[PDB]
Amino acid sequence: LKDCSVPNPSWNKDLRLLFDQFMKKCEDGSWKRLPSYKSQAQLFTRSFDDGLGFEYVMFYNDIEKRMVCLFQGGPYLEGPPGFIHGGAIATMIDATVGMCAMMAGGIVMTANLNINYKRPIPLCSVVMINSQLDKVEGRKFFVSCNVQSVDEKTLYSEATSLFIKL
Amino acid sequence: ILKDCSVPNPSWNKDLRLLFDQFMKKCEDGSWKRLPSYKQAQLFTRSFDDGLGFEYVMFYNDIEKRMVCLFQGGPYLEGPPGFIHGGAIATMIDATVGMCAMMAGGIVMTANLNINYKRPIPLCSVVMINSQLDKVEGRKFFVSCNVQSVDEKTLYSEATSLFIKLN
């Protein structure tokens, strides 16, 4: 029984810093860290050995209906030379907005994902994916997110998504 | 000396092999061409051992500005239990539409990807991604695609995209 959403040696200084900061936010119970555990099937985002692929941890604020994913993209996520593949970014966006929708609505299927890639993300960077449930209409759950640098000054990507309650 | 990965290996299901054969036949007259794919930093879509991750091959038709990707998603691409992660589907879509733009007009970067998922794709299934360069306005390349079953009776996903040519 391994929880992948706690530090391991591959974690960069920036990821560790934000992790500590969000763990502090959990102290009053407004935020909560989500564990991420790991016939051949494996969750895509946890299918790389430590450091090589997706390194991440999600924190959830139920009152705000907000899911923040701290994400460090490893060398096997390359697309354009030196940058994280558009698909890998989309994968972490999907994972974050999808978990946000699931916390609010239970089991849901992804219906639409619409991503604006504003600036390319350097390989081995740490980014913060801030997602939020924007509205619920019957069985429709609308979630948006941003992907930003640790200092919040660089906006890498923005996305909207729609999930449907099964 | 790099191994071309866009060819059959023992992990390939028979329906993928049959469709591969059909597209190799379409290459006969030169209209279509199979794209070699080769493998620190590694191309995301080639970072798994055979069969476990992305198994795919692209065929390009230059006169049509059309790119077809044959894709079999392995067990390590799971999202919802038993199905391909939406991110993995988005990855192969991005790979296909991005390569279509690149073969037509050169080095580009993804600017928008808008994916409608109509039906979930079972894990270890084979699909065909058919993409088309629809228009070009300056540095802007507009590419759309769909994702279907091999027999084309099931529509899994549709997408539009925007790529920007680098200066």
Concatenated DSSP letters of A116-166 = EE-SPPBTT-EEEEEEEEEEEETTEEEEEEEEEETTS--EEEEEEEEEEE-
Instruction: For residue A105, give the nearest of A62, A59, A64, A141 by alpha carbon.
Output: A141
Determine how many CB atoms are found less than 10 A away from the CB of residue A79. 25
Determine how many CB atoms are found less than 10 A away from the CB of residue A27. 8
Inter-chain residue contact A91 with B91, CB threshold 8 Å: yes
Tokens 């974690």 locate to A11
Structure tokens given for B84:
């391909």
- C-alpha A51/C-alpha A55 separation (Å) is 6
Active site residue A20: no
User: Does B145 lie at the interface with A, CB-CB under 8 angstroms?
Assistant: no
Method: X-ray
Q: Where are the domains of chain A?
A: 1-166
Task: Go through chain B and list every residue after which a break occurs, taking a C to next N gap over 2.5 angstroms, comma-separated.
Answer: 39
Determine how many CB atoms are found less than 10 A away from the CB of residue A154. 14
Inter-chain residue contact A114 with B115, CB threshold 8 Å: yes
Query: Resolution in angstroms for this experimental structure?
Result: 1.6
Q: Does domain B1-167 have CATH number 3.30.70.1140?
A: no
User: CB of B109 within 8 A of CB of B103?
Assistant: no
Answer yes or no: is B118 a known binding residue.
yes
- C-alpha B74/C-alpha B81 separation (Å) is 13
Tell me which CATH homologous superfamily contains domain A1-166: Hotdog Thioesterase (3.10.129.10)
